[PDB]
């Protein structure tokens, strides 16, 4: 009986030096991300809408133009909703599908349904268009390094559909895509041909980004079994800061603060956490002031903060993968 699913417990990062850190900082472009990945997502995209379809096409297109060998899968299913049966489509983007272990980054690409109000449309800029754009920018910025993966560990990105409740949150009205994907991966043998391990045993760590893009975010350390990874984000932020690689940033107002949070926050990670998957939940506490209002738009996004977080995340990913 192989003990490979236990490898994640001991996996250590391969830390980048100063020179490598300046390279990562210089290799990501907040303006390119803004125009090529984010703006096309700032549209009404609740499940089943024409916008949902457009969002999904945009995401698959931006991934397909890259050199790395991404394998795209659309996981489509039906679920009961307050409005009756509906169709949903998760987008899964994987490097090295038969690779036993994967570091997983995720966000939801749907936008909460709201009828038009005084000609205003809800586009959920921080929730979660920016997290989506950040994942695409990461795939783009690290493309050359990720191409080299073509430790049986690789990378996977998941864009969940239907994270939002159609009405207000309830156990049955919310997290449609993730409750579905979690159960699916929990009952899918992995790697192919395996006798007793599933795709969930292969998830080294689930890094879920939500509500990112507002000013002064503060991310607490939610789980003891991922606490050492939270610490790495703290170390990275601190070193990028000391090297002068972040913009309009101070240690007093650092994003990753030494402090926990006992309460449960409902999000796409829940269905995975309840099946034993380690989670690093990158959601700030408190939530952006514009949370679930028509003001969660482009105008209220803090550009340098997103840029800083892009650098932190890309470094975290390269260190995890030893790239």
Binding site for Zn ion (CB under 5 A): 127
In the complex with Zn ion, the residue whose CB is nearer, 127 or 319, is 127
Q: Bridge partners of 279?
A: 206
Query: Whole-angstrom distance between the N-terminal and C-terminal Cα of the chain?
Result: 29
Angle at 272 between CA 270 and CA 273, to 5 degrees: 65
Which spans in the chain are helix H?
Answer: 7-10, 18-26, 30-33, 50-64, 130-141, 143-147, 176-186, 227-242, 270-273, 303-321
Query: Residue 156 or 210: which CB sits closer to Zn ion?
Result: 210
Query: Which of residues 44 and 127 has its CB atom nearest to Zn ion in the complex?
Result: 127
Secondary structure (DSSP) of 160-184: ES--S-SSS--SSSS-HHHHHHHHH
- Residue 146 beta carbon to Zn ion: minimum distance, rounded to whole angstroms: 29
Closest approach of Zn ion to the CB of residue 165, in Å: 9
Smallest separation (angstroms) from Zn ion to the CB of 127: 4
Q: Which residue is nearest to Zn ion (CB)?
A: 127
Q: Which is nearer to Zn ion, 66 or 294 (CB)?
A: 294
Minimum CB–partner distance for residue 221 and Zn ion (Å): 22
Report the alpha-carbon distance of residue 135 to residue 91 in Å, rounded. 13
Distance, in Å, from the CA atom of 237 to the CA atom of 249, rounded to the nearest integer, reads: 10
CB of 210 to Zn ion, least distance (A): 8
C-alpha to C-alpha distance for 112 and 56, rounded to whole angstroms: 16
- Of the pair 127, 137, the CB lying nearest Zn ion is at 127
């Amino acid at each position: 009986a192989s003990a490979w699913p236990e490898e994640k417990n001991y996996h250590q990062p391969a830390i980048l030096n100063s020179s490598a850190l300046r390279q990562i900082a210089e290799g990501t472009s907040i303006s390119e991300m803004w125009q090529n990945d984010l703006q096309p997502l700032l549209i009404e995209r609740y499940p089943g809408s024409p916008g949902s379809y457009a969002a999904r096409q945009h995401i698959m297109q931006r991934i397909q133009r890259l050199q790395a060998d991404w394998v795209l899968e659309i996981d489509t299913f039906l679920s009961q909703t307050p409005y009756g049966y509906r169709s949903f489509s998760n987008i899964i983007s994987t490097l090295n599908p038969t690779a036993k272990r994967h570091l997983v980054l995720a966000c939801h690409y749907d936008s909460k349904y709201f009828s038009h109000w005084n000609n205003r449309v809800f586009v959920g800029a921080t929730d979660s268009a920016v997290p989506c754009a950040m994942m695409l920018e990461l795939a783009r910025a690290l493309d050359k390094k990720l191409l080299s993966l073509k430790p049986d560990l690789s990378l996977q990105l998941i864009f969940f559909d239907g994270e939002e409740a159609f009405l207000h949150w309830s156990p049955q009205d919310s997290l449609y895509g993730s409750r579905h994907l979690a159960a699916k991966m929990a009952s899918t043998p992995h790697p192919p041909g395996a006798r007793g391990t599933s795709q969930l045993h292969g998830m080294d760590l689930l890094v879920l980004l939500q509500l990112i893009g507002a000013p002064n975010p503060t991310f607490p350390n939610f789980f003891p079994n991922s606490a050492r990874w939270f610490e790495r984000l703290q170390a990275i932020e601190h070193e990028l800061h000391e090297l002068g690689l972040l913009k309009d940033h101070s240690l007093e107002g650092r994003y990753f603060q030494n402090y926990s949070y006992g309460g449960v926050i409902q999000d796409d990670h829940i269905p995975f956490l309840r099946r034993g998957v380690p989670v690093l939940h990158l959601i700030p506490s408190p939530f952006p002031e514009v949370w679930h209002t028509m003001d969660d738009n482009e105008e209220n996004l803090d550009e340098s903060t997103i840029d800083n977080l892009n650098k932190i995340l890309q470094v975290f990913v390269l260190e995890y993968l030893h790239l």
